[PDB]
Design a protein around this ligand. Structure first.
Ligand SMILES: [Zn+2]
Length: 46
């Protein structure tokens, strides 16, 4: 997850929950299902 520095060309599509970006719509979609499956990460204990 990086924006601003990576890729001088801002994509037309960008997530809202994480703020991701995908020059294409197809990819962005497949990513819209990555959050649903809460993964063990972050400040969570573990
Ligand atoms: Zn996202």
């Amino acid at each position: 997850g990086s924006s601003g520095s990576s890729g001088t060309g801002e994509k037309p599509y960008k997530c809202q929950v994480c703020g991701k970006a995908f020059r294409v719509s197809s990819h962005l979609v497949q990513h819209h299902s990555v959050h649903s499956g809460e993964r063990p990460s972050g400040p969570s204990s573990g």
